[PDB]
Design a protein around this ligand. Structure first.
Ligand SMILES: *[C@@](C)(CO)[C@](*)(O)[C@H](Cc1ccccc1)NC(=O)[C@H](Cc1ccc(OC)cc1)NC(=O)[C@H](C)NC(=O)CN1CCOCC1
Ligand SMILES: [Mg+2]
Ligand code: NA
Lengths: 233, 240, 222, 250, 235, 231, 212, 244
């Protein structure tokens, strides 16, 4: 039985025609205190997978070490470690999903919500979620925390079902993700302006973008707002 | 824990430790079991090189496992106590779970199973003991006599003997015991048992023990004078 | 305090015919008032013409299905590729569930297939292993809505023969696969209307001696 | 891996001898001579400090050891075996007695515990017996002064006076002539030094001889004052200077 | 001495090979498999005439559809039978069905090599496991202390095994009736047995799909012995 | 001689005699053959019987849908090792959703057999195995020896008179390796290979045992009337 | 549940309902609450369905192992005590079982044993177990005599379950009858309350509280 | 491995004897003789100390005779160290029985349990047996005065008069000659000393080479008293019987 201390907020993601996009802000909250501002919550595994993690940061750092160790262990006695027998997103996910459910069953969970985004060896897009309860699900769009409430509605307007994926380009998909991150900065009290974004394409590969900022924000209309009702001045 | 496999096969297919345990049984004092029409009698030799004994307190050769079953033995005396104790515990455990006392076959099967376990367990030697287990099943008047041995095999006997010079008394019983007509009464059964021991014993004084078991938990041990009367009667008929 | 259980919603339904059996379930996955997936299947082909679904807490449901699939695999290894009968699978599942009697799998389980006489069979389980064979069973969040409808339309309950003064019951009879699928689709559309955890899509798995076939139908997405 | 020796390494031979115990006693015979003498008002235990090398500092190696404030021990045989026995003997005095009764054990009972440890090395799995004989001198309120010998078998005997090791046969004969039941402590120390000179060959002084007594209480050696009932240790190790003083009037 | 799990230079386990010699000293046991059933028969071999021969239990029930006959150090078989019975009943509990005869035999044979320095030595007893299931029908298995088991159409184990096996080689065909098999076991037992064969020193049993595993009475076996003697004199 | 009492003892020339005696048990075992192309891998096994009344000892065991082996030597030891493989293959599936690589399968068997050759009390495994499989890097064939040594090969054979089949495959190497997209022809080559190890006996219907795995073929075993095609 | 079993002149009658509940939700109406352990032994179920189902099937396996080992059918006393000793090991853990082990043997005769999850084991002639036990007792006790005929005893057992099925909200579905004699148990059919009620009301003239 | 060095202490000879038990008995036959004699009104325990040295402290010494509880004592023959292990077990077993039943332990029960421990060392564990033979002298309200003996085999028997250790053959013949059933304690005291005096390997039997003890009902009314004799008391009893 735990209680989360230093936490990370929403992780959002979606599929597009050739691959997947995933994003998450760089904040490490300590309750209401916005304590740490240089936290990377997107962790690449190889050149074909990115794991986005929210929840407890100490448990996130533990998972980082497991994934780091997984790459090492896979390389052992494996001449095709950088080829046919390289780590797939589906392998990495199933490992984590096994761990998460084992820990909840021992009543000592890893207090996290995880999204594994990647591209398989056959070109298929991989996007699947897992959390502290060991609950797993997949969808064209996936998001954690506040992202589930605010991002998914926006991302589902772009890709509402499976047939909408081939019709969605990387330019359109990234635009929707960046818009969603802005909306979360407006409305999530444990979010930050700075964030990271990752694209895993079946042609261009892994593109990891750091130090992004939310921009083109609408604040001007605030100047006209007075009191809470009757106040004219 | 001490793990050594002491009981093992030899090239000719024998487990010597089990066979040497049989030699210890052959050294032990003679014990005989004869079952009649309505009873079983257990006879036991007691070696007479020991005078100045205290027969009140000296461990008796025949032991009660329950009120309806008895166990005599031949071989190592110290080893027999361990088997008797285990058997007595299992007897009470059976009454507790099945709500019925053990059958003589079941009790024998348990004791035999213990003996067998010590022939293929690491760190232990076999029991240097063969037992005669006799009694009557609950609510049954059919007499029961069983034998066990170090190897773990057990079987039922109309009459049987174990211990030193047992082959001589078995020879006697084989011609004197009629399957078609077993000893009809208690007296006949005790006499045949005493007769068989008199082939081997020496004197019929404080060398022979006799225990009679009858149906419904009716077990009694004979005293010196009672046994001596059979000895006196047999010898007078012999001179003919 | 940490709560190890959750409710992922949805609902499932199994009906048995004379020479077939269906096991249906909606494809919606939820937590609280949010939708996680509009298409997340929870009715699986487990081999040996057995289909299975464990509805309730998805993590427990996936774990159970995963264990049973693995149970089928080892049954082949250990017993010379023998086919696992539906009655034997049911008993095996009871032991899987009851093994966690004091920390249960929070799922209502249903399996379907054919019995050893070739006839359609549906077995249903409670969360701790009690099971029963039936012609009909609904499980999950909307089971209370659907089940009485099936009692009426599959087992003809409370239906009497017209003009017989309520003395002669409507006779029992097997249904065609076409009639059964009509009942399944109507059952799920009705359930989708009045239960918020039910919707998005409907996936049916039909089992005949020829194998396992699938059918998919859209459901309301609100 | 793991200790697979779970069986006895000391067993009975056809003649009835316990070989390893006999051989352990042979090792004690080879060892340097040590002795003990009981007086009316004290006990003395003494031994030769056989130096392994003149570069070695023989002060750092203590053959005579304090076990409790009123009990001391000396040995003949294998030094390492003795050292670990002293460690175990000191600890058992606390664990099996002082931590229970709030006072130190009497000599006979501590001796009994040491004997138990040595007996177990004679019967337990995968071990040889200890290659030492101990002489344990001590005092307690209800038994007074006492002197005990402990052999590799675990057997122990009380003595008025005795010697063990190299020249024990001659030393025991010497002690029989000199010992009486009216000996004062100083007279016993004198006899101890006389007896030991016979077995020692090289130098005979306070630096080559190790000698301790169980006598009167020593308040100066207690380390604190304020508790009337605590009067100090009866065990005292004689200094190199204190030995040489008595060697002049020898 | 030497290790219990040691290999010989020829590539065999000493203890397993020595246990096979113990089995050769054991009393004869024969099994014959037909399309109408599987017959099991044994030599009782009482060591003395005072011993009540009906207490000699060398044929044993494992389940209603599986029987077993033994030869060698028969005391060692008790724990093997106990395991087999539990395995059979346990499988029925887990799977609501009868367990395959092969699967049962395989479970018993898993005990065989669980010895070393687990139990201290191999078993000194061989088993003939006969049974029926829906998949492979009537089956006869020979289970050794090596952990190996062979299926047989017919098989003899014990002291008269090599002589009886050569006889079974000639006599067995795929169209034997149950009655023909019963007589054949009695015939071959009488040949290899020391003492003269009768109902008291030999025991028959069979397993059929309909009636399951049945040990024959001394009255029933006696008539088959009398039927056998008459048929041999008739030509 | 004096250095063959247990596996923990080296000889003066640096030999482990108990391991060599375990190796000897394989030579006494019935012949079995393994060979592969680029699309399929095939096991062919000559089964052995006690006599005419007995069944023929089953030589081939399935480990997963994509992997399995044939045995030669102590059959119970093969059962232990095959069971270990089944678990390892299964662990890879449940935990990583990943079919176990045939190369890793060999590495795991090597390490399991090794531990038995360095510790007191235990003994070496008394069986040799031929593992075939199809994974993400195509078809594979492995040869396991109870010394621990595992070897990847195009083709091989173990058991009594295995040198005859091994020589044939060494000649036929260039031919059978290019039998791609043709199961029946690759089996024929294997059946012809095992025939070089036959003496006095010939391949009958309940004597021959064939197994195959490939690109669009799960590991399946053929016995009885199913192998009559290849005689 | 409502289950009963009583001893009488002609052996033992055993009658049970067939309802399963999950709170106020009727989970089933066609459940088997009698387990046929062997041709001479029966077991009734009441309480947690899984506990009853699982452990009484397990009990049957233990009874089978007994007759294999001992070459003799297990006694009703020994069979009941295996189950009672088992649940006593789990005492406090939360098992919920109300059971009746009914059967015949030569040494015992017709015998009934009540066994529950808190370790109580009682021999007796009449028992009613379950949520509707009181309703069944009311009818059964007021009509019970030792000298009942097999025909009358079968009916009384059927009528007692019906009475409880009616009043008890957590009992109903159908009545499963059994009769245990010296020759073993005999099944006397499944009787749906949907038809049985109106048939009994009309023929018997009872149930005047209900609108006819 | 270690198999090479295993003596195999718990195995049978081809003749069916336990090697180690037989060799332990051979060891005990060289130990100082101990005699037990049971009278109608008490029990005597007499034991000869092993070749004494003149500088041995005699009064504060215990080698042969030990107290198990207020009603039971033992005479030892063999390894003293081994005996003390068994004695402390026996002392604890007696207190366990008293704690459980609020009654002093019956003599036979204590004897059986101690003998069962010895038995265990001959059948399992791979350890050497205890090289000890006991003479148990005790009293309880069931059988009254009782003498027992146990040996390394774990076999125990009851006696009227018995010897263990050295020269038992000669000692048992002398006891068998002069013993009778109506004997008193003071007569048994004399018999015990006379027997040792003749069977001793020493030149002459003296007070300093003996341990002596009696268990009488010679206390005040229906209660038992254990008397472990002091040196001066042995000196007096030796003069009183006319041995010195
Ligand atoms: C009547 C109907 C009263 O309920 C009977 O007792 C009936 C008996 C019965 C026996 C065998 C098969 C079916 C029915 N009992 C029930 O129907 C039973 C009631 C009950 C539930 C829980 C209990 O405590 C654990 C005790 C009694 N119903 C069930 O078992 C239902 C089907 N299942 C569950 O409630 C599932 N729960 C059980 C407890 O553990 C968590 C899951
Ligand atoms: Mg809806
Ligand atoms: Na209820």
């Amino acid at each position: 039985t735990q209680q989360p201390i230093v936490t990370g907020t929403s992780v959002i993601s979606m599929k597009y025609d050739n691959g997947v996009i995933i994003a998450a802000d760089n904040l490490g909250s300590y309750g209401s205190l916005l304590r740490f501002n240089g936290v990377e919550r997107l962790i690449p595994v190889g050149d074909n997978t990115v794991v986005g993690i929210s929840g407890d940061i100490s448990d996130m750092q533990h998972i980082e070490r497991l994934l780091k160790d997984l790459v090492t262990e896979n390389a052992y006695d494996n001449p095709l470690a950088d080829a046919e027998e390289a780590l797939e997103p589906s392998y990495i996910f199933e490992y984590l999903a096994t761990v998460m459910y084992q820990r909840r069953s021992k009543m000592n969970p890893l207090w996290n919500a995880i999204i594994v985004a990647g591209v398989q060896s056959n070109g298929d897009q991989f996007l699947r979620y897992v959390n502290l309860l060991g609950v797993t699900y997949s969808s064209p769009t996936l998001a954690t925390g506040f992202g589930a409430h605010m991002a998914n509605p926006l991302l589902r307007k772009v890709v509402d079902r499976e047939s909408d994926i081939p019709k969605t380009t990387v330019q359109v998909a990234e635009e929707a993700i960046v818009n969603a991150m802005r909306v979360l900065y407006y409305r999530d009290a444990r979010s930050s302006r700075n964030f990271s974004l990752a694209i895993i394409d079946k042609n261009t590969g892994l593109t990891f973008k750091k130090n992004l900022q939310v921009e083109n924000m609408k604040w001007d209309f605030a100047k006209d707002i007075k009191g809470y009702g009757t106040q004219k001045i | 824990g001490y793990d050594r496999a002491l009981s093992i096969f030899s090239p000719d297919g024998h487990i010597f430790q089990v066979e040497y345990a049989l030699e210890a049984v052959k050294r032990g004092t003679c014990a005989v079991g004869v079952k009649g029409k309505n009873c079983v009698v257990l006879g036991c030799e007691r070696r007479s090189t020991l005078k100045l004994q205290d027969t009140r307190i000296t461990p008796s050769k025949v032991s009660k496992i329950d009120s309806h079953v008895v166990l005599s033995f031949s071989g190592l005396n110290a080893d027999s106590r361990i088997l008797i104790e285990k058997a007595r515990v299992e007897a009470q455990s059976h009454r507790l779970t099945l709500e019925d006392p053990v059958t003589v076959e079941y009790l024998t099967r348990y004791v035999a199973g213990v003996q067998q376990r010590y022939t293929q367990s690491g760190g232990v030697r076999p029991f240097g003991v063969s037992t005669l287990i006799a009694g009557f099943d609950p609510r049954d008047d059919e007499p029961k006599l069983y034998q066990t041995e170090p190897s773990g095999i057990y079987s039922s006997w109309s009459a049987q003997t174990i211990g030193r010079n047992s082959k001589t008394v078995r020879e006697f019983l084989e011609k004197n015991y009629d399957r078609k007509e077993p000893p009809a009464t208690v007296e006949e059964c005790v006499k045949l048992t005493v007769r068989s021991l008199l082939e081997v014993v020496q004197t019929g004084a404080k060398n022979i023990e006799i225990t009679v078991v009858k149906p419904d938990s009716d077990i009694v041990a004979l005293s010196s004078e009672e046994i001596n009367q059979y000895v006196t009667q047999i010898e007078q008929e012999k001179q003919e | 305090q940490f709560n190890p259980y959750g409710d992922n919603g949805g609902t499932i339904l199994g009906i048995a015919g004379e020479d077939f059996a269906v096991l249906a379930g909606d494809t919606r996955n939820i937590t609280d008032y949010s939708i996680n997936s509009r298409y997340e299947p929870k009715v699986f082909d487990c081999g040996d013409n057995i289909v299975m679904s464990a509805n309730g807490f998805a993590a427990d449901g996936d774990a159970l299905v995963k264990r049973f699939k693995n149970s089928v695999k080892w049954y082949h290894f250990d017993h010379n590729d023998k086919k696992l009968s539906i009655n034997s699978a049911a008993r095996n599942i009871q032991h899987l569930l009851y093994g966690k009697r004091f920390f249960p799998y929070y799922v209502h389980t249903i399996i379907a297939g054919l019995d050893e006489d070739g006839k359609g069979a549906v077995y249903s389980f409670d969360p701790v292993g009690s099971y029963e064979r039936e012609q009909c069973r609904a499980g999950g969040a909307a089971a209370s809505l659907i089940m009485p409808f099936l009692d009426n339309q599959v087992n003809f309950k409370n239906q009497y023969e017209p003009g017989t003064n309520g003395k002669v019951k409507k006779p029992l009879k097997y249904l065609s696969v076409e009639e059964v699928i009509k009942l399944v689709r109507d059952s799920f559309t009705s359930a989708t209307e009045r239960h918020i955890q039910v919707g998005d899509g409907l996936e049916i798995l039909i089992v005949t001696k020829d194998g396992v076939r699938k059918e998919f139908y859209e459901l309301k997405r609100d | 891996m793991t200790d697979r020796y779970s069986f006895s390494l000391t067993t009975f031979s056809p003649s009835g001898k316990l070989g390893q115990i006999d051989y352990a006693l042979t090792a004690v015979k080879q060892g340097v001579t040590s002795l003990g003498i009981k007086a009316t008002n004290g006990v003395v235990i003494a031994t030769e400090k056989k130096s392994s090398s003149p570069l070695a500092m023989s002060e750092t190696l203590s053959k005579v050891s304090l076990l409790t404030p009123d009990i001391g021990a000396v040995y003949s045989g294998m030094g390492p075996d003795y050292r670990v026995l002293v460690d175990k003997s000191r600890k058992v005095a606390h664990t099996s007695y002082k931590r229970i009764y709030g006072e130190y054990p009497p000599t006979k009972l501590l001796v009994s515990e040491v004997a138990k440890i040595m007996q177990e090395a004679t019967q337990s799995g995968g071990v040889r017996p200890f290659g030492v004989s101990l002489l344990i001198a001590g005092h307690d309120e209800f038994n007074g002064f006492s002197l005990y010998q402990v052999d590799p078998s675990g057997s122990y005997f009380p003595w008025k006076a005795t010697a063990i090791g190299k020249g024990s046969v001659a030393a025991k004969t010497f002690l029989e002539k000199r010992w009486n039941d009216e000996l004062e402590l100083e007279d016993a120390i004198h006899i101890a030094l006389l007896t030991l000179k016979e077995s020692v060959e090289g130098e005979f002084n306070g630096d080559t001889i190790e000698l301790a007594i169980i006598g009167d209480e020593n308040p100066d050696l207690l380390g604190y004052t304020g508790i009337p009932t605590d009067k100090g240790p009866r065990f005292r190790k004689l200094t190199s200077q204190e030995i040489n003083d008595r060697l002049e009037a020898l | 001495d030497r290790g219990v799990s040691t290999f010989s230079p020829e590539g065999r386990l000493f203890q397993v090979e020595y246990s096979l010699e113990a089995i050769k000293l054991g009393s004869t046991a024969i099994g014959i498999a037909t399309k109408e059933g599987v017959v099991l028969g044994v030599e009782k071999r009482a060591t003395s005439p005072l011993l009540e021969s009906d207490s000699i239990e060398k044929i044993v029930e494992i389940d209603r559809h599986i029987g077993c006959a033994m030869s060698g150090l028969t005391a060692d078989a008790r724990s093997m039978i106990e395991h087999a019975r539990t395995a059979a009943v346990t499988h029925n509990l887990y799977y609501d069905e009868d367990i395959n005869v092969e699967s049962l035999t395989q479970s018993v044979c898993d005990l065989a090599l669980r010895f070393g320095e687990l139990m201290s030595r191999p078993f000194g007893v061989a088993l003939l496991i006969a049974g029926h299931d829906a998949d492979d029908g009537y089956q006869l298995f020979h289970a050794e202390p090596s952990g190996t088991f062979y299926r047989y159409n017919a098989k003899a184990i014990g002291s008269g095994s090599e002589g009886a096996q050569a006889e079974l080689l000639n006599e067995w065909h795929s169209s034997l009736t149950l009655k023909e098999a019963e007589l054949l076991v009695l015939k071959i037992l009488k040949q290899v047995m020391e003492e003269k064969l009768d109902e008291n020193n030999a025991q028959l049993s069979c397993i059929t799909k309909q009636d399951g595993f049945k040990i024959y009475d001394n009255e029933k076996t006696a008539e088959l012995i009398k039927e056998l003697k008459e048929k041999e004199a008739a030509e | 001689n004096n250095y063959d009492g247990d596996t923990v003892t080296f000889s003066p020339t640096g030999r482990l005699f108990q391991v060599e005696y375990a190796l000897e048990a394989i030579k006494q075992g019935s012949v079995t053959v393994g060979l592969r192309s680029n699309t399929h891998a095939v096991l062919v096994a000559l089964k052995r019987n006690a006599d005419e009344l007995s069944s023929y000892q089953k030589k081939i065991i399935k480990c997963d849908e994509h992997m399995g082996l044939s045995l030669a030597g102590l059959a119970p030891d093969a059962r232990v090792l095959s069971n270990y493989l089944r678990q390892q293959c299964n662990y890879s599936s449940l935990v990583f959703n990943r079919k176990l690589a045939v190369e890793r399968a060999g590495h795991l068997l090597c390490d399991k057999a090794q531990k038995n050759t360095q510790s007191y009390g235990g003994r070496p495994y008394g069986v040799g195995l031929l593992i075939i499989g199809y994974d993400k890097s195509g078809a594979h064939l492995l040869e396991f020896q109870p010394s621990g040594n595992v070897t990847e090969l195009y083709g091989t054979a173990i058991g009594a008179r295995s040198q005859g089949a091994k020589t044939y495959l060494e000649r036929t190497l260039d031919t059978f390796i290019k039998i791609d997209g043709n199961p029946d022809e690759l089996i024929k080559a294997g059946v012809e290979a095992i025939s070089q190890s036959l003496r006095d006996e010939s391949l009958t219907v309940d004597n021959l045992s064939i197994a195959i795995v490939g690109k669009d073929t799960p590991f399946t075993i053929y016995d009885g009337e199913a192998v009559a095609k290849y005689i | 549940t409502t289950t009963l079993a009583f001893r009488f002149q002609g052996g033992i009658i055993v009658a049970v309902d067939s309802r399963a509940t999950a709170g106020n939700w009727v989970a089933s109406q066609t459940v088997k609450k009698v387990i046929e352990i062997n041709p001479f032994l029966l077991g009734t179920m009441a309480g947690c369905a899984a506990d009853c189902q699982f452990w009484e099937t397990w009990l049957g396996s233990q009874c089978r192992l007994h007759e294999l080992r001992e070459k003799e059918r297990i006694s009703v006393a020994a069979a009941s005590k295996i189950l009672s000793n088992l649940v006593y090991q789990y005492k406090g853990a939360g098992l919920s079982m109300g059971t009746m082990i009914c059967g015949y043997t030569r040494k015992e005769g017709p015998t009934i044993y009540y066994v529950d999850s808190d370790g109580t084991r009682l021999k007796g002639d009449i028992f009613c177990v379950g949520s509707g036990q009181t309703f069944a007792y009311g009818v059964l006790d007021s009509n019970y005599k030792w000298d009942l005929s097999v025909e009358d005893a079968l009916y009384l057992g059927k009528r007692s379950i019906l009475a409880a099925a009616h009043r008890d909200a957590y009992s109903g579905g159908s009545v499963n009858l059994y009769h245990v004699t010296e020759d073993g148990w005999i099944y006397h059919g499944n009787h749906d309350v949907g038809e049985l009620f109106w048939k009994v009301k009309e023929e018997e003239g009872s149930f005047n509280n209900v609108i006819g | 491995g270690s198999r090479r060095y295993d003596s195999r202490t718990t195995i049978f000879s081809p003749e069916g004897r336990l090697y180690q038990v037989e060799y332990a008995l051979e060891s005990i036959s060289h130990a100082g003789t101990a005699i037990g004699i049971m009278a109608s009104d008490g029990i005597v325990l007499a034991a000869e100390r092993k070749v004494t040295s003149t500088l041995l402290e005699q009064d504060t010494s215990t080698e042969k005779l030990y107290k198990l509880n207020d009603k039971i004592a033992v005479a030892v023959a063999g390894l003293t160290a081994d005996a003390e292990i068994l004695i402390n077990t026996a002392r604890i077993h007696a207190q366990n029985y008293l704690k459980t039943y609020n009654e002093d332990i019956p003599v036979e029960i204590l004897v059986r349990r101690l003998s069962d421990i010895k038995q265990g060392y001959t059948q399992h564990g791979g350890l050497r047996p205890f090289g000890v033979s006991f003479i148990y002298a005790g009293y309880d309200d069931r059988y009254g005065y009782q003498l027992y003996t146990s040996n390394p085999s774990g076999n125990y028997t009851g006696w009227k008069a018995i010897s263990v250790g050295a020269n038992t053959s000669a000692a048992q013949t002398l006891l068998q000659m002069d013993y009778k059933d109506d004997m008193k304690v003071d007569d048994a005291i004399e018999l015990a000393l006379k027997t040792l005096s003749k069977t001793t390997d020493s030149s002459a039997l003296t007070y300093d080479r003996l341990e002596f003890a009696t268990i009488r009902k010679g206390a005040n009314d229906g209660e038992v008293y254990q008397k472990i004799f002091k040196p001066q008391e042995i000196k007096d009893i030796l003069v009183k019987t006319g041995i010195t």
